[PDB]
Amino acid sequence: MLSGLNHLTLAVSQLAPSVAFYQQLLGMTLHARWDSGAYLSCGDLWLCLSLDPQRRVTPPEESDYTHYAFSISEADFASFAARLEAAGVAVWKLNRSEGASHYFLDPDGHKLELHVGSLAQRLAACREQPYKGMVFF
Amino acid sequence: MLSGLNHLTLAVSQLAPSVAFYQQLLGMTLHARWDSGAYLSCGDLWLCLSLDPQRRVTPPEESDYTHYAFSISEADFASFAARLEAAGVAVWKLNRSEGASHYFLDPDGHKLELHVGSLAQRLAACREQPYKGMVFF
Ligand SMILES: [Mn+2]
Ligand SMILES: [Mn+2]
Incomplete structure (x- = not known):
């Protein structure tokens, strides 16, 4: 049985501006970043930004x-x-x-x-x- | 500030098979449907399926x-x-x-x-x- 949304992952073309948008402009909490992505939270939401050249x-x-x-x-x-x-x-x-x-x-x-x-x-x-x-x- | 995900809306090309997928196959709760969409929940996730000719x-x-x-x-x-x-x-x-x-x-x-x-x-x-x-x- 599914109990909720576990996470939302957005493919991004450039990691730095996307982190700036979600963390600094939108005020989400940045928990971790690596060469090809980031994890943020917004209340209960787990957001993943995934660097993807196909975006x-x-x-x-x-x-x-x-x-x-x-x-x-x-x-x-x-x-x-x-x-x-x-x-x-x-x-x-x-x-x-x-x-x-x-x-x-x-x-x-x-x-x-x-x-x-x-x-x-x-x-x-x-x-x-x-x-x-x-x-x- | 922002406090989480209010809802997820997925554009769908055919409403009935999409409702069946999320409700029957995945077990989400169907609350309402109409000619152009449906509302479901999965725990505290509000899912909206929106019929979209562009999908x-x-x-x-x-x-x-x-x-x-x-x-x-x-x-x-x-x-x-x-x-x-x-x-x-x-x-x-x-x-x-x-x-x-x-x-x-x-x-x-x-x-x-x-x-x-x-x-x-x-x-x-x-x-x-x-x-x-x-x-x-
Ligand atoms: Mn994932
Ligand atoms: Mn909406």
């Missing part, structure tokens, strides 16, 4: 909707978004769903998100206003 | 090392891996370069992993058998 710096129009959302409190959301904006981090989507969301790109074009709100909160909103074809279990 | 079924030699690992206990690991193998689930990696792991593909070629152990345990293992150039903070 392309990918424009958002050229990747699908797969994306990775990090939790932040409502009270902290606006100043964190402003920090990303000051740093020139690109946005790939505007928020049109429930709960604050900021959609931003990492240095290689990985699609990231800041989101406020849990699955329970989303399900409650969906029960009141179900998406087309929505069934609950 | 392509991608062979593992065509994608980079970005991957998603799910936690499993030492007692359950081998039989779960063997069940996936017997079910014909495609693979993408064989060499255990980061501990006890089984590397397998979802229907669209998303790179998945079963892994036994925490970040703390992986750091302790790496102190004895470190990756080249490894530094610990």
Whole structure:
């Protein structure tokens, strides 16, 4: 039986700017680094950055909707978004769903998100206003 | 600050086979589905499958090392891996370069992993058998 997400590994084209982005800009804790990768944590999340020459710096129009959302409190959301904006981090989507969301790109074009709100909160909103074809279990 | 992973969203090309893979084959909990997506949980992971016409079924030699690992206990690991193998689930990696792991593909070629152990345990293992150039903070 699977008990949760063990780790998220992102392939990166250049290790130093990716470490700078996740550790310094996004405030994650750097636990270890080696010639071809790094381990960071963000709350319970174990993040691995893996240097991979096959990673392309990918424009958002050229990747699908797969994306990775990090939790932040409502009270902290606006100043964190402003920090990303000051740093020139690109946005790939505007928020049109429930709960604050900021959609931003990492240095290689990985699609990231800041989101406020849990699955329970989303399900409650969906029960009141179900998406087309929505069934609950 | 950021406090962990709020959700993982995977773009999928065909919603029903992807729901079946995560719910039936991997045993995740299905909470809701709709014409364009589904919400599942795996422990405290919120997984969203999002139907995306841009998603392509991608062979593992065509994608980079970005991957998603799910936690499993030492007692359950081998039989779960063997069940996936017997079910014909495609693979993408064989060499255990980061501990006890089984590397397998979802229907669209998303790179998945079963892994036994925490970040703390992986750091302790790496102190004895470190990756080249490894530094610990
Ligand atoms: Mn999202
Ligand atoms: Mn892994």
